[PDB]
């Protein structure tokens, strides 16, 4: 159930996806949409098995891409509660207002 694209006419652009299952035409003759000699289905199967070598074992990959745009940035890290001390002269930082 895990597949990869082995054959494509042109290289992918960054952050592009191709879901096409069209038969890859490597030869002058038209494929006609039926698999035939010199015509190969692009999507091949990753036949994962538990006894494979470490190079071939399945690995799950998550790629995190961070982008900044002219719009106000709305994804930011945690904010520290710290603690509140009263009745003393303490440097206060309340929601970005300092003193």
């Amino acid at each position: 159930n895990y597949l990869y694209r082995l054959f494509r006419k042109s290289k992918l652009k960054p952050f592009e996806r191709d879901i096409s299952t069209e038969i890859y035409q490597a030869g002058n003759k038209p494929c006609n949409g039926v698999a035939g000699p010199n015509c190969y289905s692009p999507l091949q199967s990753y036949g994962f098995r538990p006894t494979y070598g470490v190079g071939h074992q399945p690995y799950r990959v998550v790629v995190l891409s961070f982008e900044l745009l002219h719009a106000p940035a709305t994804v930011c890290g945690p904010k520290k509660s710290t603690n509140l001390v009263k009745n003393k002269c303490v440097n206060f930082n309340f929601n970005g207002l300092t003193g």
């Binding site: 054959f7 030869g27 010199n38 091949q44 098995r49 006894t51 494979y52 070598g53 470490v54 190079g55």
Partner: protein
Amino acid sequence: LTEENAKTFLNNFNQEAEDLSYQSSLASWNYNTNITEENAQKMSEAAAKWSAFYEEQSKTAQSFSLQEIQTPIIKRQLQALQQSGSSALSADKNKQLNTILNTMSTIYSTGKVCNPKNPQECLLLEPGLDEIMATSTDYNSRLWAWEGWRAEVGKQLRPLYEEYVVLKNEMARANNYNDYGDYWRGDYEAEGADGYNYNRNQLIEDVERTFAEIKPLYEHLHAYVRRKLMDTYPSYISPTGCLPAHLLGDMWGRFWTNLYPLTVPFAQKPNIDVTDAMMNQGWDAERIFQEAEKFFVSVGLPHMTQGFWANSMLTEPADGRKVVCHPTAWDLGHGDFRIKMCTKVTMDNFLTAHHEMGHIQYDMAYARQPFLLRNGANEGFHEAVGEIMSLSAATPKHLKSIGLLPSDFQEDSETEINFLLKQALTIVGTLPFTYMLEKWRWMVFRGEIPKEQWMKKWWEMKREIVGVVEPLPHDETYCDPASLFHVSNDYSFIRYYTRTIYQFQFQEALCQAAKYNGSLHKCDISNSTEAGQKLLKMLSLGNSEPWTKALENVVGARNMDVKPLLNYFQPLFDWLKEQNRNSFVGWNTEWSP
């Protein structure tokens, strides 16, 4: 364009092939470790699917024409894929040849020779006759065993060989080869850049050239063995004559290793055996493989995989599953490397573990290469790489370094001499038998030997080359070669000769790389990373490049050289020359008692 089409075809093939080959290899492993009917049938279906896919791809691959392919790696991959082998013939001829092969295999497996006047004592070759050849000293019993197995096997197998030669000749001609001998010699053919070109015809002359250099050392060894056997057998062996066929310690005379107690130089001096030391220190098979791994990392080759430790069997399971005793190294595919060996805590198993680990390291190095090129450069190279590790492992320096042998051990000349003689009996002795057998098979396939004069030629060559005479005259109704396992089961035999030459050449090259300043036989390649890199350059290549290039990569030469073999055996050669001065070195062709 044709080259691009071949590249896409190979890319599709490697992904489909690797998966199917892994399924076949895994089913074969499951049968080998856990012998049963269901694992056998599963192996049968897996092999059937893999073979059907491989033939279908080979038929598609034959459409491509090699003339318009410029890149050597794609051309070599297509060459490997396009070898039809036995599929070239028609179905009727292929079925007849398969029937002949199957009946030959079963008849050899079930071969029976039985005691005259003692009917109940009927003996198979594998349980008891080999024991008689290895251990018995009685002349009459050996003469009986040799003659009886020769008579039964030769009389039954002579017609089968007669049509076997014709069918193999038809298959080879169908595959654009001159004869079946040329088809076997194709495996050493290398097509490549200028000066690396090797031809099938060249191989025979190269073997003969190597043989001439090997011949004085073999003649001295034969004379010494003949004198010692004469001491053992007082009147049945002549000083100037050839050795009898049944006194060589083996059924066929293939290995002289069983003659070592009779032919020991120094009886008083013990062997270098370290089994008792392993017993005292509580070593086990896991420790043996770990020490082999330590040697491989120390020389600079990579560590063993986690899968190798997890999945392999290094001990008899003893849980009710039958196993094959023989040690085998398996490259299942997809980075899965395993060893099946029922390892007992002995020195021989320790050396065998080093040999099989060498096979696994050789398999691991060329995993980067494409699927069709994940093989040895030739048949000899794969065995040779394991053999050099076996040679290095057995040295006294290696045993002292790892604590198997005591630190205060003294290496006198006498132990070196008897060890070298044992190595010669195992290694030097097999070479004339191998050369003579391969030459006979090549000439029979060629038709140089007439059909009705086969036996008369073979004994003559054994008289000329091996220097071993028949005990009793054999007419042409006999088929004396066919008693050997390799010939009856359609196996090439020149690989052992090439293995023997390559093993010493590789060992000298690594020792020069490691800057060892002493005798070649005492050399150890441990803790020499440069030697490991020098070896690994050949190991990474596989058969992507011509074997001559790989040979140049290790030894700096493009052809077989037996000067390392003479250099390894030089103290023994000097000793044999020293003790043969009174005696006559050489044999007389005519039959002498």
